[PDB]
Amino acid sequence: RMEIVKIPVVVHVVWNEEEENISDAQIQSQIDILNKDFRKLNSDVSQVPSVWSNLIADLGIEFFLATKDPNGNQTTGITRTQTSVTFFTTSDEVKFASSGGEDAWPADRYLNIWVCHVLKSEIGQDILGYAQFPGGPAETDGVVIVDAAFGTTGTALPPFDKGRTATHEIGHWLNLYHIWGDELRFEDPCSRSDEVDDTPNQADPNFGCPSYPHVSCSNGPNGDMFMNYLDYVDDKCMVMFTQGQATRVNACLDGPRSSFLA
Numbered sequence: 001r002m003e004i005v006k007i008p009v010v011v012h013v014v015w016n017e018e019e020e021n022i023s024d025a026q027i028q029s030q031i032d033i034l035n036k037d038f039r040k041l042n043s044d045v046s047q048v049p050s051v052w053s054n055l056i057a058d059l060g061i062e063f064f065l066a067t068k069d070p071n072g073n074q075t076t077g078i079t080r081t082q083t084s085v086t087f088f089t090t091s092d093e094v095k096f097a098s099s100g101g102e103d104a105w106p107a108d109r110y111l112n113i114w115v116c117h118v119l120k121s122e123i124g125q126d127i128l129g130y131a132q133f134p135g136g137p138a139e140t141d142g143v144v145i146v147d148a149a150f151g152t153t154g155t156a157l158p159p160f161d162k163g164r165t166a167t168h169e170i171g172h173w174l175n176l177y178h179i180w181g182d183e184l185r186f187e188d189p190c191s192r193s194d195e196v197d198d199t200p201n202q203a204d205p206n207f208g209c210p211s212y213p214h215v216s217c218s219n220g221p222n223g224d225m226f227m228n229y230l231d232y233v234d235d236k237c238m239v240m241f242t243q244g245q246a247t248r249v250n251a252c253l254d255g256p257r258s259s260f261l262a
């Protein structure tokens with residue numbers, strides 16, 4: 001039997017233009033997606049190649065907008081903060097009031113999700129989101145998602161309008177790594193592991209939505225599990241976690257994030 005671990009979420013909406021101050025419906029829509037994806041209740045789980053049907057996992061995690069604030073008072077679980085900042089980066093400016101963002105709530109008790117309009121990587125690439133893996137400082141613990149890739153209504157835009165950027169980032173929050181192993185440009189593309197036996201060794205990230213099979217690193221005939229949430233495919237194309245990933249998530253919940261357990 002699964003222990004359903006129920007994670008209180010606080011959504012920090014950080015907005016410059018009014019349109020960035022996203023609706024309650026848009027936020028709720030994202031929560032609803034998390035509650036499908038992390039319970040194997042997403043209808044599109046039917047898209048997984050049958051050869052891997054046996055590996056599809058129910059992570060046994062559910063999410064709710066916090067009902068009590070950090071001091072035990074009634075809350076909506078949503079903060080809304082106006083800013084003069086026009087973009088944020090992986091350097092965590094969104095996570096501090098002093099840099100035009102919003103401070104984290106206590107990371108031992110809440111999953112902090114920040115939503116902002118524009119995110120850039122350190123090299124200036126526009127990106128959709130980023131996470132902090134377990135073990136990092138509480139001050140910056142959580143996930144950040146751009147509003148146009150958050151939820152399934154309002155400002156969300158295809159092909160990132162099915163709530164999967166958050167599923168992917170919360171995957172990292174729960175100690176899951178990119179399925180292809182994150183090689184640096186000069187490294188052998190088949191050399192790094194995601195530390196999960198049941199995810200096939202994979203050369204590079206997949207984008208868009210590959211045709212099955214997409215073989216790499218001699219992983220034929222079945223090929224890359226590109227429909228896994230820890231690849232880089234479009235929202236409608238990623239639809240599953242594996243049981244091997246659930247093992248890692250379970251270790252995370254039992255150890256560094258054990259504070260979330262009942």
Ligand SMILES: CC(C)[C@H](NC(=O)[C@@H](N)CCCNC(N)=[NH2+])C(=O)O
Pocket residue numbers: 121125126127128129130160163164165166168232233234235238
């Ligand atoms: C850095 C790459 C190019 C970039 N990745 C992200 O923004 C990543 N943090 C989230 C991927 C979300 N994918 C999805 N289907 N919801 C990118 O993919 O462009």
Ligand SMILES: [Ca+2]
Pocket residue numbers: 090091092140
């Ligand atoms: Ca940092």
Ligand SMILES: [Ca+2]
Pocket residue numbers: 179193194195196197198199200201
């Ligand atoms: Ca693997």
Ligand SMILES: [Ca+2]
Pocket residue numbers: 180181182183189190191192202203204
């Ligand atoms: Ca690889």
Ligand SMILES: [Zn+2]
Pocket residue numbers: 168169172178
């Ligand atoms: Zn990622």
